[PDB]
Write a protein that binds this ligand. Structure first.
Ligand code: HEM
Ligand code: VT1
Length: 413
């Protein structure tokens, strides 16, 4: 079991898989001239919309990615964290003195609530949430297996998808027009950043399609990644064995933070929760939400004496790569504290839950803050137990989440 590169031919296409840190090197270390995202990620274009992300040419795409990075910078996150905390506290306040919850359903709800606020702004959060959630659900239901091959197939799900997108644009057109009418009012959200964004060489702001598309993209990200890793984080920690070993260190750490900082959850406090961080990271190691990341090969390369020609699609599976024993001792065991030592390793591309290199996750820090917020609030206010077996990965959506039901029992402290 030290195969680390192999090829299928399927549908007349050569798929080449790269497993483990050495094989990863040609995937992550190269750039846009050598590897292309366009063709593998076609499926996303009619979801986010035309001329947005993988539907834009490189020139525009590279600038859109800089806008996104700005919207999720450290500075921006400082101002979002209060919002993220409030939403979480309001949400879990609604909970009874004890009961049972599907954690996956719950965190999907909370994360899309929070995202609507930070991404899309107060107006939408407070006036139009239900409309936005419904429109998103429709978008998401137009992502079928067939859609990765034929995105613009005129089947019903695709029609409703396209209609839902256009509706979403119309909704934001109103908010944007109102904001341009009153442009001296500052707003704390990604929308503001996208409204102030300008392409270079041009007095051109993004139109409403592009702005809406960038926000669909980021909403999609949170629902497809953060919400699942957020669920696993708890499912894994509050399994009886894992709970025994690891929860003490976590609860201790929360109390040490409260003594230095107080009851208030802040950027600085969350940034100190190392043991909780590693719990999230280990859930991510074991059940990464993205099955594959992919590129079309433009410039051929060899790894060992294995030749990968132009026109190949190369794949990395974070799931596979991070179950390799040579890299991760007891690969199939839950051990958060592996990352004390693992984090000190010099060799690149061992952990690839957030990808790496030029196109690594720009939302990593946001994800950690969102997920640590959730579990900080939960840990501080409840005693929690896993109901039954640890769920198995469910591969039906275009996302690998824990299979329903994902039940936790809670009792208030
Ligand atoms: C724990 C949750 C998350 C995981 C596991 C995750 C994972 C990843 C991975 C593996 C990539 C690389 C994709 C590729 O190479 O093609 C990526 C890219 C990206 N992620 Fe995330 N992500 C997460 C959360 C987020 C969040 C919350 C956002 C923002 C809303 C976000 C925004 C992005 C963006 C914009 C990229 C594009 C990188 C590029 O093409 O340059 N992610 N993410
Ligand atoms: O990488 C994403 C997802 N993401 C990244 N971070 N959080 N979510 C992405 C990238 C940039 C964004 F702005 C928003 C995004 F959501 C993405 F571009 F849409 C994306 C890329 C690849 C996949 C993907 C994952 C697994 C797949 O399985 C392969 C198979 F379907 F079997 F053929 C197929 C596709 C999903 N989303």
């Amino acid at each position: 079991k030290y195969g680390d590169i192999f090829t299928m031919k399927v549908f007349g296409q050569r798929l080449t898989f790269l497993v483990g840190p050495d094989a990863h090197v040609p995937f992550f270390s190269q750039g846009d001239a050598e590897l292309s995202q366009d063709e593998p990620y076609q499926f996303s274009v009619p979801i986010f919309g035309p001329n947005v992300v993988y539907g834009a040419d490189l020139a525009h795409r590279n600038q859109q990615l800089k806008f996104i990075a700005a919207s999720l910078s450290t500075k921006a996150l400082q101002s979002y964290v209060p919002l993220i905390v409030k939403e979480a506290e309001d949400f879990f306040a609604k909970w009874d003195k004890s009961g049972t919850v599907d954690i996956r359903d719950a965190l999907a709800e909370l994360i899309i609530l929070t995202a609507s606020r930070c991404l899309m702004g107060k107006e939408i959060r407070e006036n139009l949430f239900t409309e936005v959630a419904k429109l998103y659900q429709t978008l998401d239901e137009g992502l079928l297996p067939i859609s990765v091959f034929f995105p613009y197939l005129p089947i019903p799900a695709h029609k409703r998808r396209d209609e839902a997108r256009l509706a979403m644009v119309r909704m934001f057109k109103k908010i944007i027009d109102e904001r341009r009418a009153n442009p001296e009012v500052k707003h704390n959200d990604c929308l503001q950043v996208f409204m102030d964004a300008r392409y270079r060489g041009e007095e051109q702001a993004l139109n409403d399609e592009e702005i809406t598309g960038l926000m669909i993209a980021l909403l999609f990200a949170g629902q497809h990644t953060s919400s699942v890793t957020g669920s696993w984080t708890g499912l894994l920690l509050f399994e009886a064995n894992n709970k025994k070993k690891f929860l003490p260190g976590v609860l201790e750490e929360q109390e040490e933070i409260r003594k230095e900082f107080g009851d208030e959850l802040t950027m600085e406090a969350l940034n100190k929760m190392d043991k909780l961080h590693r719990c999230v990271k280990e859930a991510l190691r074991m059940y990464p939400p993205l099955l594959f990341v992919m590129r079309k090969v433009i410039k051929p390369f060899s790894y060992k004496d294995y030749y990968v020609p132009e026109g190949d699609t190369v794949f990395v599976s974070p799931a596979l790569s991070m179950r390799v024993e040579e890299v991760f001792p007891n690969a199939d065991q839950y051990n958060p504290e592996r990352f004390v030592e693992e984090d000190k390793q010099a060799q690149k591309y061992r952990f690839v839950g957030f990808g790496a290199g030029r196109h690594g996750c720009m939302g990593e820090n946001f994800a950690y803050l969102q997920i640590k917020t959730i579990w900080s609030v939960l840990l501080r206010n409840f005693d929690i137990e896993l109901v039954g077996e640890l769920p198995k990965p469910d591969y039906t959506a275009m996302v690998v989440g824990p299979a329903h039901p994902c039940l936790l029992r809670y009792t208030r402290k």
